[PDB]
Design a protein around this ligand. Structure first.
Ligand code: HEM
Ligand code: HEM
Lengths: 453, 453
């Protein structure tokens, strides 16, 4: 069968369709019009967007397709190098680092991070307890403070001290400016044009900032004479069982950058969407609060109590169903293949999985795919293979998934135990896109339940 | 640290604890009571049972510990001699045979076995296709017919023709009766009593049928004048690269018996437990069956398609986590040493790894350790070293591991492609123990999907 394709702009083909603040939301709209697959052509490149579980379960066969670096990720590689997110599977440093850092997300490791997650969570709760009558909460801003600080402390014993700051930490300003520079690069006809010399001067400055903090984190660890078993411990000391080799210096630097960027943004998105859906669905908020109060019976949560917040977990999954905060991942064909018995592909051909659309496939989820209903996840194992993919696929799936979900479950649980929430502006969801998705301008009021912490 | 010890029986010490049909399960229950290590005393022997990954990972250090023959294996050596399973690592014939036969398990060799594995697999599928409307399947019975036939045919070009029989083949009747006589001998206070002279004559009779079949297998091969590149070809003609020597006649006979025994029973257990867990976990059954339908698109599976059954592979590994079919292995201290910083051992001290307990270490796997969740094996690198050992350890690990999993993956794939399964009796798991583990009395109904074979 011949592939649907959205409207074209002459020699620019489809490229102007992504000249927008909201490209993923644009593609989702295309997917609504054209169905489970469409061709997307730009000058000198072609990809195919998949939206159905039927096709995506084939794309997620690792014998037939491997992770591809999208143009965006290729530009990310200019500062994240061969860190885990921006490495090819066949690069030696991918499997090495994969093997070395996976124990940093073991069950023992997760227990060891719990205390410091509580440290940051207490700081959030205290900030909100200390607000005056009628003040509000800037939700994504506060959630980004929490998640940046959490990965900094749990991973690196580094304190960003974001709750002491009116404005994001410099590292994040640089990071966001570098990603912003990257977004703008995706839709430029002449990269080399001298007009863009000021941008790449700014890009080089942003990379300088990120590396300055890297140098510090490393120098502090070397100088604290510490083996505080955390993510950094593993980066500096762990040896890969296959090769018997450690990470080299350069790669460690890239890993720090990678984990500092990747380790917070998607999670803050998740928390912001989850709070959004809770205030728009008071019956769900009430049920989630009921669990928080029944389970979190101590002044601070235990690891085991967090594992027992089953419904809070369902809330977080149902937020990732509707708005997966890393909304796309890219694949390539390992060999010539036919997709879905209809679409022939040649070795090298690229696919894009459009996760938000996958998560709205009515053959999987039923009629009411737009409804926020955490009960869809009562029994997570009922969900078919390759139907719910907010953490990607296979050996290149998110290494930090259990970290993300533990942090988010801890924090949301505490939030529901301690405050009642009001959507006082009747906020209209507005989704900002970077490489990630987040509510923009989401604000709430939190009335303390006056329960000691 | 003082070491826990279960309840005692006067002069008999702990030995009557193993006077049950289900000793490994009894040992697991003790492990749950007493923890990561206990001492077990008999008249004239002591061993320590290990259950934690922390201690087992040390036990698996080959510089400190070498494979020991348990009292059971020492008795098996009465007919398996210095076959690979029943040899000491320091016996010349171990490394010789290991070097000679290890190439018989190369993916190259696997490719050559595939055709004959499908032969037997097709016999099983056809049997089930030919059952009448309300008939059932005796699962362990059929899985044993299949596995025995596979190792006979692929190994030795011998056909047990087990699907043409109601009763097990005489070889397996005698092998089973001989191993049972071993099991009973592990409990007898005065072995030389005249009350057991009937048992000892029958044990010799069972040895004689095994040796009769061996003689025929060798006779058959020689008169054939063939070099059918199989496991028998290597035994008969292969030379050890290190010594430059072939196996002698005697050792060849022992290898044949060893492979015909261990080549089938553990594999048939694995298949039986896997099918058990699938019918108990319908959401996993549907995921596995969907995989099989998507991958096995030809009337007979190819070697390449069997390698694509990733989720089926996960199901098998999760059945090996809960019920590793060879549930224990034994080690001894090569020198005086201290285990786990706390438990001093003298040269020669014996250890027993209790693999089902290892696999239930909550520190490694999480709290939900009794649940059947194949997705624990989605990313191999996420499983700590020495945490999953169904195939033993190091240079003395299972040589047949690849063969076992290829056969099992092929067969379970075809079973899920061709039939729907019903747990019509709501079976209560009943685990029969020999030296190996298997469900007893497990029955299902198979409804054909009427897909041609
Ligand atoms: C809700 C939160 C998160 C979501 C939705 C998410 C999503 C994803 C996705 C979709 C991928 C695959 C990207 C691709 O195929 O190109 C991925 C990879 C990754 N994620 Fe996450 N992530 C989250 C949280 C985290 C956290 C907390 C960390 C670290 C602490 C992290 C570290 C990574 C890394 C290192 C990779 C690359 C893994 C590899 O290829 O070996 N993520 N994530
Ligand atoms: C699921 C199936 C199987 C399991 C769970 C399994 C398990 C084991 C274990 C635990 C050992 C080590 C024993 C010890 O340390 O005392 C072992 C050794 C062995 N297995 Fe397997 N096995 C399986 C299948 C097979 C197959 C199919 C074959 C032959 C075709 C085979 C042949 C052997 C041999 C020859 C050894 C001794 C290797 C040596 O020491 O050099 N096994 N098996």
């Amino acid at each position: 069968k011949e592939m649907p394709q959205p409207k074209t702009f002459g020699e620019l083909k489809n490229l102007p369709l992504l000249n927008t603040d909201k490209p993923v939301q644009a593609l989702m709209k295309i997917a609504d019009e054209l169905g489970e697959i469409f061709k997307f052509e730009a000058p000198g490149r072609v990809t195919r967007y998949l939206s159905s579980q039927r096709l995506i379960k084939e794309a997620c066969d690792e014998s037939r397709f491997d992770k591809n670096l999208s143009q965006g990720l290729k530009f990310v590689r200019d500062f994240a190098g061969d860190g885990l997110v921006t490495s090819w599977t066949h690069e030696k440093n991918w499997k090495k680092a994969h093997n070395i850092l996976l124990p940093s997300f073991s069950q023992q490791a997760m227990k060891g991070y719990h205390a410091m997650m509580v440290d940051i969570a207490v700081q959030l709760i205290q900030k909100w307890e200390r607000l005056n009558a009628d003040e509000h909460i800037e939700v994504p801003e506060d959630m980004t403070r929490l998640t940046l600080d959490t990965i900094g402390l749990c991973g690196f014993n580094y304190r960003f001290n974001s709750f002491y700051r009116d404005q994001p930490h410099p590292f994040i300003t640089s990071m966001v400016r570098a990603l912003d520079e990257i977004m703008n690069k995706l839709q430029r006809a002449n990269p080399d044009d001298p007009a863009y010399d000021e941008n790449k001067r700014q890009f080089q400055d942003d990379i300088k900032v990120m590396n300055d903090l890297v140098d510090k984190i490393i120098a502090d660890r070397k100088a604290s004479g510490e083996q505080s078993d955390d993510l950094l411990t593993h980066m500096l000391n762990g040896k890969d069982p296959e090769t018997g080799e450690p990470l080299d210096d350069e790669n460690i630097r890239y890993q720090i950058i990678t984990f500092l960027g990747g380790g917070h943004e998607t999670t803050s998105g998740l928390l912001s969407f989850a709070l959004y859906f809770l205030v728009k669905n008071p019956h769900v908020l009430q049920k989630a609060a009921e669990e928080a109060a029944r389970i979190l019976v101590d002044p601070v949560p235990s690891y085991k109590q967090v594992k027992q917040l089953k419904y809070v977990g369902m809330v977080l999954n149902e937020a990732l169903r509707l708005w997966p905060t890393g909304p796309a991942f890219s694949l390539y064909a390992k060999e010539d293949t036919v997709l879905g018995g209809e679409y022939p592909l040649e070795k090298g051909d690229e696919l894009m999985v459009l996760i938000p659309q996958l998560h709205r496939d009515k053959t999987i989820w039923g009629d009411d795919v737009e409804e926020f209903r955490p009960e869809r996840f009562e029994n997570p194992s009922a969900i078919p293979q390759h139907a719910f993919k907010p953490f990607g696929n296979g050996q290149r799936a998110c290494i930090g998934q259990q970290f993300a979900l533990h942090e988010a479950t801890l924090v949301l649980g505490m939030m529901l135990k301690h405050f009642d929430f009001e959507d006082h502006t009747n906020y209209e969801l507005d989704i900002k896109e970077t490489l990630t998705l987040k509510p923009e301008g989401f604000v709430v009021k939190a009335k303390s339940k006056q329960i000691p912490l």
